[PDB]
């Protein structure tokens, strides 16, 4: 993770679209390292959001220099269907997946665990799901999450996979995750705040 | 469905690849008519198989004239990883989805129902799942099927969707499904038999 840190936030809290998309594009490949086909459709959905945002950006990178520019330009371009359109909608969902990853990783780094099963990551994933995604899912998708949770790797195995080849301890691995989390968390928080400020957030369930 | 009937089988039971792929390519769009996002990853998997087979075919349509040609050419081309490779693997999975659809539709047409809930299609889908797919799924994916089953439409709604614009009765709709099922079922049966004859069938679970 720490090979692709996000940029620090500038004083004006603007997030450059190009570097943001470049950074977060390194996250979906991690889903191929979790040891299950159950992660295939997940990877697909997150990558699909990234692809959509990049496709809008590519139409005019200067116009879409920042994530704020995307929202404001699309609000002007689309009128009534906005924010349920375009890159605004894609980023609305992407931020939820990014927040899931943030909460999950932070929970692991913070030593949160089921003391009865300290080498599982279920409690960490459940917390992340509850905080990031659950209320945007109808009861059927929530039931699917609960089933998919059983496909999660052991903690020790997950941390091994995050540091393969590097010959580092788990303690060192977790320090590098904490480093990644600094600008990552700050960036996601700014994106959420922007959605509030722009009245671009929707609450529909799938 | 009856606007894209499969070809009848010739005496030699060979199935031409091009027309087969053209016909079955009309089936994944039906998943957008079931009223739920839960069908998105399903459509993606079936379409992915079709795309893979078409990509192999397109490298040399004469060499890959029939489905039998695909298996025999790939067996020669690949040696030891076969049949877990290429279009052979894609068709191995595609036939299972096609068989699911066949069993499901046939069950509906045959009047099979839960007499306590005659306007659901759960019993029909469960039968199809059991016959076509279940034993290739580990327990986690099976649990996901059980959840996804609740996203199925009402029977009357499903049959309406299959005949939209046509101004036909449900009886007429079902007669047209029965017509589609004739060459469809025969074709799928031949494909299954070919996999047996070629020793191309695998039994691994996902
Ligand atoms: C960095 C290391 C990695 C850290 C993460 C590792 C964590 C591992 C630990 C535990 C595992 C826990 C279980 C997994 C939890 C996954 C959470 C990760 C993030 C989730 C991504 C899905 C987000 C989501 O809910 N999306 C939902 C909404 O999508 C959005 O819909 C919009 C329209 O309303 C747009 O189309 C939008 O796209 S746009 O680009 O056009 O705007 C699009 O993104 C999407 O519906 C859900 C997708 C997941 C698939 C769920 C359905 C599966 C059904 C399967 C049925 C099969 C049954 C039959 C079997 C044969
Ligand atoms: C004609 C009208 C339409 C008729 C049908 C309507 C029926 C509606 C009624 C009731 C609904 C019942 C529930 C739905 C049942 C669906 C059955 C339809 C057919 C299923 C298609 C999936 C087949 C399958 O099991 N595939 C499996 C194996 O795939 C194959 O894997 C191979 C490698 O081992 C290859 O990669 C291969 O591709 S290849 O091209 O490279 O060779 C590929 O096809 C595939 O893994 C399953 C895909 C379905 C997705 C399941 C996982 C969902 C996990 C979601 C987790 C989300 C949790 C977190 C939430 C945020």
């Amino acid at each position: 993770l720490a090979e692709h840190l996000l940029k620090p936030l500038p004083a004006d809290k603007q997030i450059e679209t190009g570097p943001f998309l470049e950074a977060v594009s390194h996250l979906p490949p991690f889903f191929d390292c979790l040891g299950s086909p159950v992660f295939t459709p997940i990877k697909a959905d997150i990558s699909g959001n990234i692809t959509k945002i990049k496709a809008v950006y590519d139409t005019n990178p200067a116009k879409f220099r920042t994530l704020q520019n995307i929202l404001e330009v699309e609000k002007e371009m689309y009128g009534a269907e906005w924010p349920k359109v375009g890159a605004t909608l894609a980023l609305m969902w992407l931020k939820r997946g990014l927040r899931f990853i943030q909460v999950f990783l932070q929970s692991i780094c913070d030593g949160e665990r089921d003391e009865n099963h300290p080498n599982l990551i279920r409690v960490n994933a459940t917390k992340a799901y509850e905080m990031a995604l659950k209320k945007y899912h109808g009861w059927i998708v929530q039931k699917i999450f609960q089933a998919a949770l059983y496909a999660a790797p052991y903690k020790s195995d997950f941390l091994k996979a995050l540091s393969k080849g590097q010959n580092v301890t788990e303690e060192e691995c977790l320090e590098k995750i904490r480093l990644f989390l600094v600008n990552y968390t700050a960036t996601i928080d700014v994106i959420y705040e922007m959605y509030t400020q722009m009245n671009a957030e929707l609450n529909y369930k799938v």
Side-chain angles (χ1 to χ4, degrees), chain A:
Chain A
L1 285 163
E3 297 295 310
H4 297 284
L5 302 171
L6 279 69
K7 292 193 154 208
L9 286 164
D12 66 10
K13 298 187 174 186
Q14 300 309 115
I15 301 163
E16 296 176 45
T17 302
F20 171 77
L21 293 173
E22 195 285 328
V24 300
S25 82
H26 296 277
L27 297 171
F30 285 86
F31 288 89
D32 299 319
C33 311
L34 273 33
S36 179
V38 171
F39 296 102
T40 294
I42 296 167
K43 184 186 178 190
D45 206 69
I46 298 168
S47 285
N49 299 155
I50 295 170
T51 295
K52 177 154 300 185
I53 302 160
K54 184 60 160 55
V56 170
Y57 174 73
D58 285 344
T59 69
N60 189 332
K63 182 176 301 294
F64 295 117
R65 190 188 77 89
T66 69
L67 301 182
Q68 172 68 43
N69 291 333
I70 295 174
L71 272 60
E72 71 205 2
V73 168
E74 289 195 337
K75 172 185 185 171
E76 172 66 18
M77 270 233 306
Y78 286 99
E81 294 288 326
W82 186 92
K84 205 177 181 179
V85 295
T88 296
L89 181 60
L91 179 60
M92 193 192 309
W93 284 97
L94 178 58
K95 68 180 175 14
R96 298 172 179 167
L98 298 180
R99 177 74 82 198
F100 175 90
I101 293 168
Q102 177 217 103
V103 173
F104 173 74
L105 292 173
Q106 187 70 63
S107 174
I108 298 279
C109 289
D110 286 353
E112 296 172 8
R113 71 221 177 254
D114 178 352
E115 300 196 33
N116 296 318
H117 308 271
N119 203 32
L120 300 185
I121 64 183
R122 299 167 80 265
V123 67
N124 313 93
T126 294
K127 176 179 176 165
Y129 184 65
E130 289 170 348
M131 290 180 58
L133 279 164
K134 182 179 166 183
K135 65 180 196 183
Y136 309 105
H137 288 169
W139 74 271
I140 298 173
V141 173
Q142 291 187 17
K143 267 284 236 190
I144 292 169
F145 171 82
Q146 291 160 23
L149 194 56
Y150 289 95
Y154 288 114
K155 187 191 278 170
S156 60
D157 292 334
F158 173 71
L159 294 173
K160 258 135 57 90
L162 291 192
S163 62
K164 190 159 187 172
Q166 288 183 341
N167 192 29
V168 296
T169 61
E170 194 178 278
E171 290 76 8
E172 183 70 30
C173 178
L174 292 158
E175 281 286 80
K176 296 309 193 186
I177 299 172
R178 293 183 188 98
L179 178 59
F180 171 80
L181 284 169
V182 176
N183 294 347
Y184 184 66
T185 302
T187 299
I188 300 166
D189 283 353
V190 163
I191 295 168
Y192 271 75
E193 291 175 19
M194 173 185 64
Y195 270 74
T196 296
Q197 287 169 353
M198 291 293 289
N199 202 15
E201 179 68 353
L202 301 173
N203 288 281
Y204 72 91
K205 298 184 114 99
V206 301

